[PDB]
């Protein structure tokens, strides 16, 4: 398992590293190809829309025809998309690359989630999902760093590197993932987790994407200060995801843990609103994301638990609605931020309270059922 789980973690890391690889080099591509702002908005939207559309079907196909096949095809698609972006000198080629990348993500993430759920002992699933969330975050962190480090020779080298990594990951998955040994439909158990993940993503991506702008406009944070705050928050979140998430899973339930994390998030966000000092903002930023960083593995575990033999479908639903929230969040957040500097934090607090209400309602329904 320590070799199959490692290759699954590598696949998910590759997907989320390729996601963030494009940030440092987007203006260079726009200037080189003579693209407008409408083109930039379309290029951003295409990947997210493709992932949204493909993720549930990808998970269903992983359930039906086997997860290893869907993962391998998704890795092939990832390599094709990265190479297409590497050699693309036209807007249509770039849009096709983004679409193929979104489809590859919507095929790889549901399959990897379902397989990690399937090959895990019942007492180890939570730890594995916490590790997966930490790996996803690490890929997000390392994407832009490698993309900007390897753009000093050419703004197209990162995508050649990413395509090569996709080839290596596909070969590793073919060799190392075990072939399957052998081999719900109700749309009522999945309603609360999809609503929860959608609301939480919509309100949390709003605060995450505009954090640097908010800190620069509020407390005069230089780029190194924002980097310090982001790295401290990421270190604390990773430490809690890797070490404490599974211990909380044995003690509490998924819903109780989610509610407590959301209440902690509300408290710390309120404390962040009323902070105007440099060191106050730094110290609050260090700990303001811990509950949010632990909510994602908890939601993945809840999706896994409420499912039966449809782990891939649960992964696909999670991917679809997480990406939907992550796309719609910052767009609304920036419009609100133009009128008040504290608007994204207000959206985060509001969605946290709504999530607490949703979790409590679902817990009460469960108690009434039993």
């Amino acid at each position, epitope marked *: 398992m320590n070799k199959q789980i490692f290759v699954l973690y590598f696949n998910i890391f590759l997907i989320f590293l390729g*996601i963030g690889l494009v940030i440092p080099v987007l203006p260079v591509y726009l200037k080189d190809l003579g693209l407008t702002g409408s083109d930039l908005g379309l290029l951003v939207a295409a990947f997210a829309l493709s992932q949204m559309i493909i993720s549930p079907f990808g998970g269903t196909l992983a359930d039906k025809l086997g997860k290893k096949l869907i993962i391998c095809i998704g890795l092939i698609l990832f390599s094709v998309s990265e190479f297409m972006f590497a050699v693309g000198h036209n807007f249509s080629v770039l849009m096709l690359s983004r679409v193929i990348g979104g489809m590859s993500a919507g095929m790889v993430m549901p399959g990897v989630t379902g397989l990690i759920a399937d090959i895990s002992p019942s007492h180890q699933k939570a730890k594995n999902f916490g590790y997966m969330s930490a790996i996803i975050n690490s890929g997000f962190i390392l994407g*832009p760093g490698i993309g900007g480090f390897m753009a000093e020779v050419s703004h197209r080298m990162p995508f050649y590197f990413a395509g090569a990594l996709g080839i290596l990951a596909f070969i590793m998955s073919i060799v190392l993932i075990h072939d399957p040994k052998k081999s719900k439909i109700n749309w009522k158990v999945f309603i609360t987790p999809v609503i929860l993940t959608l609301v939480l993503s919509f309100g949390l991506s709003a605060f*995450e994407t505009l954090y640097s702008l908010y800190t620069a406009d509020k407390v005069n944070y230089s780029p190194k200060d*924002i980097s310090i705050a982001i790295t401290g928050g990421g270190i604390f979140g990773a430490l809690f995801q890797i070490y404490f998430f599974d211990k909380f899973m044995k003690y509490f339930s998924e819903l109780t843990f989610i509610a407590w994390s959301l209440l902690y998030s509300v408290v710390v966000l309120i404390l962040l609103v009323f902070a105007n000092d440099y060191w106050s903002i730094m110290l609050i930023s260090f700990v303001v994301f811990i509950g949010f960083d632990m909510i994602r593995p908890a939601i993945t575990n809840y999706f896994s638990n409420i499912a039966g033999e449809r782990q891939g479908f649960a992964g696909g639903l999670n991917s679809t609605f997480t990406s939907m929230g992550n796309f719609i969040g910052p767009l609304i957040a*920036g419009a609100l931020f133009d009128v008040h500097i504290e608007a994204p934090i207000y959206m985060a607090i509001g969605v946290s309270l709504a999530g607490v209400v949703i979790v409590l309602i679902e817990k009460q329904h469960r108690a009434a059922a039993a």
Partner: antibody
Amino acid sequence: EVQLVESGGGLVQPGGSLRLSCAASGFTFSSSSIHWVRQAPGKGLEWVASISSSSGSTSYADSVKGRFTISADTSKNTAYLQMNSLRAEDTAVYYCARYSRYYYYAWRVGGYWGGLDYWGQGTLVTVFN
Amino acid sequence: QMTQSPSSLSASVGDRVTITCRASQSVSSAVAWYQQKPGKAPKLLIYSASSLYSGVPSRFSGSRSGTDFTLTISSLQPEDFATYYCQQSSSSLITFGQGTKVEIKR
């Protein structure tokens, strides 16, 4: 994709009022605002006013506050700049521009790109009569 | 509305040019760059990007040094002889640069 067209500029009396219109068309995956920027003959660029497309919130320059009023109507996606008590320093070419911000989510890192993406042709306003 | 150095410079095609804009000390947000040719509207040249991302080499590269910002043109192509403006945003207002004109030498 988006087009901005100015209208309503011309000769005005030194003390009268004049209304500029910016007609805007086109859709983008961004947060947008409509701004007015004037250029005096031979001089640089000066920002004068701004209004938000959603939850319309106005903003004005210090040298123009009180005299000017920006508004928008979304029935035809149009913006208006009504300037009253026009003075000597108000003769310039007025452009309406579109500030657009695009977002790319990636955890607590991630890109945004903002600027005055689209500009109009501009209309000349001469205050002295 | 913001100080730009130099006010006007002249250089030959193929040369590398740097334009410095002195930005606000009350905000630390990035700066957008605009290009204007005579008789036409200004054109957005460089977007205002996230503070974490600024410095990737390119033909038109923006670089933040302390409180100042720098626009670098690596290769002076013939059609980029124009006036260049820096723009900074804030809570609600917008500030433009004084303007630097680039002229062709002979």
